[PDB]
Amino acid sequence: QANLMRLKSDLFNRSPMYPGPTKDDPLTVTLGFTLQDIVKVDSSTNEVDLVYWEQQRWKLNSLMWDPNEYGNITDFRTSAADIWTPDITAYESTRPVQVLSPQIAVVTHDGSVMFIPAQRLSFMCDPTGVDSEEGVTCALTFGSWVYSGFEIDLKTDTDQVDLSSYYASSKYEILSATQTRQVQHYSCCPEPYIDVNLVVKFRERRAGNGFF
Amino acid sequence: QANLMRLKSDLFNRSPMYPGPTKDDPLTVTLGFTLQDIVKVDSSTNEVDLVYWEQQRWKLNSLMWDPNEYGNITDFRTSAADIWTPDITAYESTRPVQVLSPQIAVVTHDGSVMFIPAQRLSFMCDPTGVDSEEGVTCALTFGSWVYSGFEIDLKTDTDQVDLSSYYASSKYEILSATQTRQVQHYSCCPEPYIDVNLVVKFRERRAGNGFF
Numbered sequence: 028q029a030n031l032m033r034l035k036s037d038l039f040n041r042s043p044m045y046p047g048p049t050k051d052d053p054l055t056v057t058l059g060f061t062l063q064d065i066v067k068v069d070s071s072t073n074e075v076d077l078v079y080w081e082q083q084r085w086k087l088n089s090l091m092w093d094p095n096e097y098g099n100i101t102d103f104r105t106s107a108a109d110i111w112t113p114d115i116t117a118y119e120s121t122r123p124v125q126v127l128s129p130q131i132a133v134v135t136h137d138g139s140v141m142f143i144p145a146q147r148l149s150f151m152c153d154p155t156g157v158d159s160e161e162g163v164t165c166a167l168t169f170g171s172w173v174y175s176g177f178e179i180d181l182k183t184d185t186d187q188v189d190l191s192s193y194y195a196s197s198k199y200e201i202l203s204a205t206q207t208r209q210v211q212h213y214s215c216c217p218e219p220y221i222d223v224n225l226v227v228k229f230r231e232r233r234a235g236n237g238f239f
Numbered sequence: 240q241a242n243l244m245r246l247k248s249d250l251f252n253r254s255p256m257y258p259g260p261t262k263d264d265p266l267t268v269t270l271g272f273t274l275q276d277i278v279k280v281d282s283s284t285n286e287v288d289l290v291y292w293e294q295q296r297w298k299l300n301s302l303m304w305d306p307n308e309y310g311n312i313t314d315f316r317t318s319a320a321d322i323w324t325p326d327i328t329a330y331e332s333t334r335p336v337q338v339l340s341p342q343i344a345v346v347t348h349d350g351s352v353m354f355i356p357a358q359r360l361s362f363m364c365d366p367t368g369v370d371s372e373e374g375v376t377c378a379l380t381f382g383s384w385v386y387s388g389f390e391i392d393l394k395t396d397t398d399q400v401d402l403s404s405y406y407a408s409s410k411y412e413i414l415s416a417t418q419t420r421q422v423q424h425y426s427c428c429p430e431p432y433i434d435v436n437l438v439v440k441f442r443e444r445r446a447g448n449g450f451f
């Protein structure tokens with residue numbers, strides 16, 4: 028498609044990239060989690076491994092275009108390396124994140140972006156009691172590493188984690204999973220930072236496939 | 240010493256031993272447990288090992304004597320092999336019982352007997368969930384193997400298991416322990432058989448010695 032080539036060239040070749048948000052031009056990132064699997068627990072190190080898709084949305088004025096000038100194109104996929112992306116980080120990870128999917132975003136003519144990488148993460152979680160009816164609860168916070176709430180605000184569209192793709196024959200069944208916007212402070216700095224608190228209650232699965 | 244030797248000779252060396260209880264002459268045995276330790280659980284076989292002392296009391300007319308005729312002796316210790324003892328049996332054991340104490344009874348002039356052997360026993364018990372706050376419940380019935388309620392009846396002096404000697408640094412802590420008289424029927428036989436149902440709720444100790 029000739030029109031799309033023109034669009035990408037015009038967007039990505041003729042100006043400096045977005046330098047990120049500032050106090051004068053803050054940005055709100057919408058977050059949502061799709062929990063796919065609780066893969067492994069480690070009771071000797073108190074780490075638990077999750078597989079999830081992390082849905083991120085935001086909007087930049089610099090990514091806008093008039094579809095009329097581009098054969099009525101209203102959106103396109105492009106490599107996430109072509110655009111600015113927010114530094115949303117898991118605050119209690121114990122290993123580097125492993126990316127499980129392509130990193131390609133969808134950009135819409137109004138400057139809005141959707142980006143949903145699949146990830147595996149090890150995080151700090153004590154799994155003692157997971158083999159009981161009551162199960163166990165762990166929490167994981169996600170937020171900008173370097174930007175305070177004055178530059179990056181966060182939002183969820185729902186407080187329910189998406190479980191519609193959770194692996195039915197996982198070793199672990201989900202009892203509940205919520206995602207909630209919170210405010211935190213770190214020793215280094217006085218300014219409020221925003222996070223999303225992912226809270227998952229789970230236990231060893233003992234009813235379903237493999238069971239009779 | 241002379242009077243005791245006389246008493247023992249007279250009680251044990253001049254008559255057939257008591258042939259056990261009958262319908263016409265039934266016997267009631269009082270049972271009580273001192274739970275000392277839950278030593279071990281095995282989740283691959285669903286066996287748990289207990290150490291307890293089993294208090295047994297009963298009374299036989301044939302063990303009576305007049306203390307006046309024996310230098311005021313009102314009771315004596317004697318090997319349990321010298322007297323009839325009830326066939327009180329754990330019904331859900333998985334290994335032969337291991338005896339941890341001498342087997343010696345105290346006999347009193349009214350023909351009553353007290354016998355409290357210490358035992359280790361492996362029994363059928365699923366310990367899944369023992370490492371949680373709720374812990375797990377298991378039960379073990381004790382009763383005559385061969386006598387129905389028409390020959391042997393049972394009772395407890397209290398429904399609360401004696402925990403005053405429980406090992407404070409056991410891997411497992413006791414949440415509750417009861418001992419309750421019940422009636423049972425088995426496939427072999429029409430008659431009711433009496434048992435005491437020992438019900439123990441426990442979990443992995445997470446406080447005290449070794450824990451910070």
Ligand SMILES: NCCc1c[nH]c2ccc(O)cc12
Pocket residue numbers: 130131132133141142143144
């Ligand atoms: N593959 C499922 C998620 C998904 C659907 N469409 C997408 C577009 C972009 C993206 O990063 C992710 C997605």
Ligand SMILES: NCCc1c[nH]c2ccc(O)cc12
Pocket residue numbers: 292342343344345353354355356
């Ligand atoms: N040694 C604890 C139990 C105990 C105290 N006195 C006893 C007399 C007889 C017996 O079998 C047992 C006992």
